[PDB]
Design a protein around this ligand. Structure first.
Ligand SMILES: CN(Cc1cnc2[nH+]c(N)nc(N)c2n1)c1ccc(C(=O)N[C@@H](CCC(=O)O)C(=O)O)cc1
Lengths: 210, 214
């Protein structure tokens, strides 16, 4: 019944400001006690940014107070986050949550990327070798995160490892491996399917020997 | 600021085990109304952190009885009387008694298993990438346990460190192993200066070596 839904832009340019909306359903933002904004940094630590109370008074993380503004729209049952002079260090998954005598409810969270980089599709390369056989796919120089990698539209998922993306210098790179029996390859087709929604790309790279 | 120290940061367990996580506060977390706003959260991968316990010992809605919280002053404890398959993930303690409201670093509740050596696979750069003037050499160190394995690149007898990009997967749900990818990023020209490319899985002798010649 209770739902907290984050919305807003996924990309923000450095020095510009990030604005997010929390749409609340199941109960009113007018119910005690606090309506929070939280962020989780890449593979990381959680930070409580601040809250707006059920009565509209704000409490901020002292370090963010000067850049941060939390507001609310009681009739729309929404509360808002504004973070001003943003740095690359503001790249995080942003969540909204609530606290009261019943405990706490949390939204799903959205990744907000702060970068000067422009949207770029990845270059997808097949990785064939020089009882079991490992093959791979190199997904290079895309922006922003994420990409999705599937092997033969999911039928090979069992022996698949999709590694987390690394940022260098302002672009992302990832690799994905698949291991199948020697009987299955090169005799049968092994294809790597890469999708980058942000740049509307869907590439299918087949693994060809020699 | 109130600093929250979680002990340990990594909790290896077997299913059915009793588990305990400690949360040590740098100062008292009793708010001016006499309440202690000490909370425990569980974050499963991809998901947002979900509340287990609030106000030290109150179980949130839908939280099983095997999860219990206790403590006072500066020492708080989360106990899991029986670890179930669904309880695996990262546990956080949080304090809401003093501003700024703060979290601990997180405790990874992970499955124990026997040691496993990685499977090493080395890949020369693709013809497609070479045509663009790029040459990435990729290596996989797959399905090992515990995290105690590293990569070492040797190019014609000399250790290579510059231009190496590494990434580690989370614990695999299939068999409780870890995997890592290592990419040596070169230009086509840089790649052409060398012959023998070696990728090794190392431990604190004995490395698992894979190599090719250009
Ligand atoms: C000091 N805290 C702030 C506090 C505590 N834990 C948190 N935990 C989370 N997850 N988020 C936030 N924002 C929190 N904020 C705090 C203090 C007093 C009341 C309070 O007076 N609560 C009730 C009832 C008080 C009562 O028990 O009579 C009210 O309706 O005013 C709430 C929170």
């Amino acid at each position: 019944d209770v739902q907290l839904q984050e919305s807003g832009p996924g990309l923000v340019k450095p020095s510009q400001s990030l604005s997010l909306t929390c749409t609340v359903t199941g109960f009113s933002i007018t119910s005690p006690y606090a309506w929070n904004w939280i962020r989780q940094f890449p593979g990381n630590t959680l930070e409580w940014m601040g809250y707006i109370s059920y009565r509209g008074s704000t409490t901020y993380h002292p370090s963010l107070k000067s850049r941060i503004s939390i507001t609310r729209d009681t009739s729309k049952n929404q509360f808002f986050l504004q973070l001003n002079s943003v740095t690359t260090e503001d790249t995080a998954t942003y969540f909204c949550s609530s606290y009261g005598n019943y405990g706490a409810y949390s939204g799903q969270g959205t990744l907000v990327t702060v970068s000067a980089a422009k949207t770029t599709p990845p270059s997808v390369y097949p990785l064939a070798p020089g009882s079991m056989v490992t093959l791979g796919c190199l997904v290079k120089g895309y922006f922003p995160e994420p990409v999705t990698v599937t092997w033969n539209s999911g039928s090979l998922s069992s022996g698949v490892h999709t590694f987390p993306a690394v940022l260098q210098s302002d672009l992302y790179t990832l690799s994905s491996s698949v291991t199948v029996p020697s009987s299955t390859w090169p005799s049968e087709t092994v294809t790597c399917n890469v999708a980058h929604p942000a740049s509307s790309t869907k590439v299918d790279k087949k693994i060809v020997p020699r | 600021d109130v600093l929250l120290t979680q002990i340990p940061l990594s909790l290896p367990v077997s299913l059915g085990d009793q588990a305990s996580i400690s949360c040590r506060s740098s100062q008292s977390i009793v708010h001016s109304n006499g309440n202690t706003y000490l909370e425990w959260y569980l974050q499963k991968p991809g998901q947002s952190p979900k509340l287990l316990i609030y106000k030290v010992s109150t179980r949130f809605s839908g939280v099983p009885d095997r999860f219990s919280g206790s403590g006072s002053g500066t020492d708080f404890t989360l106990k899991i009387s029986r670890v179930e398959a669904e309880d695996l993930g990262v546990y956080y303690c949080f304090q809401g008694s003093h501003v700024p409201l703060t979290f601990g670093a997180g405790t990874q509740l992970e499955l124990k298993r026997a040691d496993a050596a990685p499977t090493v696979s080395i890949f020369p750069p693709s013809s497609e990438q070479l045509t663009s003037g790029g040459a990435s050499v990729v290596c996989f160190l797959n399905n090992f346990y515990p995290k105690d394995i590293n990569v070492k690149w040797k190019i014609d007898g000399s250790e290579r460190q510059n231009g190496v990009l590494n990434s580690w997967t989370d614990q695999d749900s299939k068999d409780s192993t870890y995997s890592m990818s290592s990419t040596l990023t070169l230009t086509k020209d840089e790649y052409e200066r060398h012959n023998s490319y070696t990728c090794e899985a190392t431990h604190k002798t004995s490395p698992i070596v894979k190599s090719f010649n250009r």
